Amino acid sequence: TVPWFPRTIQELDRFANQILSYGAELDADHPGFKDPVYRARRKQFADIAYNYRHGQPIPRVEYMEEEKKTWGTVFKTLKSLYKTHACYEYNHIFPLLEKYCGFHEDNIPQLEDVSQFLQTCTGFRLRPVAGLLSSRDFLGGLAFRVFHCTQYIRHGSKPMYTPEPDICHELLGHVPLFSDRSFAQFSQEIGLASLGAPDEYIEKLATIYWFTVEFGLCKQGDSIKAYGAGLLSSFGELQYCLSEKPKLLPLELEKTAIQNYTVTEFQPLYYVAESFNDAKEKVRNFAATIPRPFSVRYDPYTQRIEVL
Ligand SMILES: CNC[C@@H](O)c1ccc(O)c(O)c1
Ligand SMILES: [Fe+3]
Secondary structure, three states: OOOOOOOEHHHHHHHHHHEEOOOHHHOOOOOOOOOHHHHHHHHHHHHHHHHOOOOOOOOOOOOOHHHHHHHHHHHHHHHHHHHHHEOHHHHHHHHHHHHHOOOEOOEOOOHHHHHHHHHHHHOOEEEEOOOEEOHHHHHHHHOOOEEEEOOOOOOOOOOOOOOOOOHHHHHHHHHHHHOOHHHHHHHHHHHHHHOOOOHHHHHHHHHHHHHHHHOOEEEEOOEEEEOOHHHHOOHHHHHHOOOOOOEEEEOOHHHHOOOOOOOOOOOOEEEEEOOHHHHHHHHHHHHHOOOOOOOEEEEOOOOEEEEO
């Protein structure tokens, strides 16, 4: 029968008891696997996320010198590429994040301050996430303009590498785009399309998310730039995605939804969005093809989903 989905923003609290309990930091393959301090530190952030409840301010954390150093390295190395490789919406908001959110090499921004900033721009808010959420729950949060965000940082031994999202990827990759109104509406449409959708369609929406929010390219006049969070947080792939090597195709959802992708090497192909308004329209039409015995609408005045 129709899978359960949250109907009010507070119901997202139900997700904490539905994450993958054995995280990536437990794999012998993880850069911090042999480091017990790192291990304990990850558990500390997981407990903060576990006890968090909608409406509370997100707990502030004092990062260690070693963690600030890793942030600094990532920030400084990536920043040199944005003016030439990132889509206009990213560069338009970055200076404001540097001024009101403390995006600077010597300081890791606190999620509460960043969340307040997003609320003022587009009403998006962040909530700390323990471990891995199912695609269903992750996408469902977007329907409420809620982005589940990691608060921990990657292990210091390999600053330019992370096998999972971490705070550098969330803040330098995702946050700037969520401050844009059209991108915010586009992300929310993916979320609304996921509510109560059958498992096989959630996987199609997760793939569309991968080829837009995480690895999307924008058409900007006669040029092509990156807006994908996975590209904006990867020094190597951000330079590669705008070279002659990858194959670029126009975003066509019937096609993007079933395309296979690798999570371990640079993407061999990327989809180019005409604009976020256009991508939003395409998702809305795609959503109409999803078999759901009902229709949904979000009411921002009450923060509830209306089931039609
Ligand atoms: C929890 N869903 C899949 C996960 O690998 C995932 C999802 C969304 C992201 O933005 C991301 O960087 C990683
Ligand atoms: Fe991400």
